[PDB]
């Protein structure tokens, strides 16, 4: 799960049913209920990629954009999340359009639930069955990655260890 060459987008994430400190330095290694001094004295694998601004959105019970539309943790949680840098692996010149996210949806999701659909969103009164012009937009939008981006826009590969 950690050394996979291909990582899926956040809207359609992978679900997969030792020592973890032999990797790169970690931007966000925090845990809830259990501590890293208690995990070694102690399972699902859900992984996706998140831009550097909203890495803090992956948290139990807080609102936002990716934490309300794509993947969000319930208020009660015992597992935790590991975030780590990926700039020379998944960012390259010209952009990386493999990593999508969903922006528009009818309502927020149930916990631990994913949605893969390209039904065109409706934001008005006239029913747009298949026309994504004005007042009707495509759900999935892509956010590329270039080496000219700053410290808050790198694609951070991330994974949660649900217990």
């Amino acid at each position, epitope marked *: 799960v950690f050394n996979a*060459t*291909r990582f899926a987008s956040v809207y359609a994430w992978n679900r997969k049913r030792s020592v973890l400190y032999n990797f790169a330095p970690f931007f966000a290694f925090k845990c809830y209920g259990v501590s890293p001094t208690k995990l070694n004295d102690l399972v699902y694998a859900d992984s996706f990629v998140i831009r550097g601004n909203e890495v803090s959105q992956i948290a139990p019970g807080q609102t936002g954009n990716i934490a309300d539309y794509n993947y969000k943790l319930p208020d009660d949680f015992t597992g935790c999340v590991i975030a780590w840098n990926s700039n020379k692996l998944d960012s*390259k*010149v*010209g*952009g*990386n*359009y*493999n990593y*999508l996210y969903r922006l528009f949806r009818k309502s927020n999701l149930k916990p631990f639930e994913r949605d893969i659909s*390209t039904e*065109i969103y409706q934001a008005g009164n006239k029913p747009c069955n*298949g*026309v*994504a*012009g004005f007042n009707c937009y*495509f759900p*999935l939008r*892509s956010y*590329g990655f270039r080496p000219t981006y700053g410290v808050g826009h790198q694609p951070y590969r991330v994974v949660v260890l649900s217990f």
Partner: antibody
Amino acid sequence: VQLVQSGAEVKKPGASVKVSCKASGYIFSDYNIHWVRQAPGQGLEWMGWISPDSDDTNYAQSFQGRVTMTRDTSITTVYMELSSLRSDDTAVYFCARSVGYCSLNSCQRWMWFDTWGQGALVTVSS
Amino acid sequence: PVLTQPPSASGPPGQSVSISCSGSRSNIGTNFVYWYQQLPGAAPKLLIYKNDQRPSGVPERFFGSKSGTSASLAISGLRSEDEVDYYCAAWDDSLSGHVFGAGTKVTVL
């Protein structure tokens, strides 16, 4: 960015074609290489793309089991194999670089062919 | 499920000419459409992308827009360069492959 294709040769039907193009002056691993054919008389037609960091060769539904596309990453080339070419396949062939890079299927909304190499046509008849 | 468009459009110099392009459910109106200009006997290049955007070096007189399941391209100023073939290019999800137009010929009067 510069893309150079090979020349045009005589191919009797039932034989294979040696069509290829190279990448120069830019990083070859971060850009897809789509292929576009064009018969003289009508519009363009799509073939498939190469992801030059793995082995992912997607094709169209019409020519799914007909074409053979192969990466040779050593000398930054992209090779292509068509065996038993037929009379309707007489066309000029382009390889094109798309901006960005994706290997999925629901990622082609932001893919347009930026730069194009010069074409190389193929022949028919015994 | 292929894009359809008039094979040729002719206009006098002095006003613009409009090129229309209509598509199916999975060609236009669910995905972006691009316009490609082909020099005669050479490699075609991008002229319109992202439905209102242009690369640098393209003169600010080429106009394109879409309203429903069809798209329109307008070229203002026709003296010595725009007498070439134009192509309506868009992504298709039904065929899961890139699809193109038949080819529009522009002739001045």
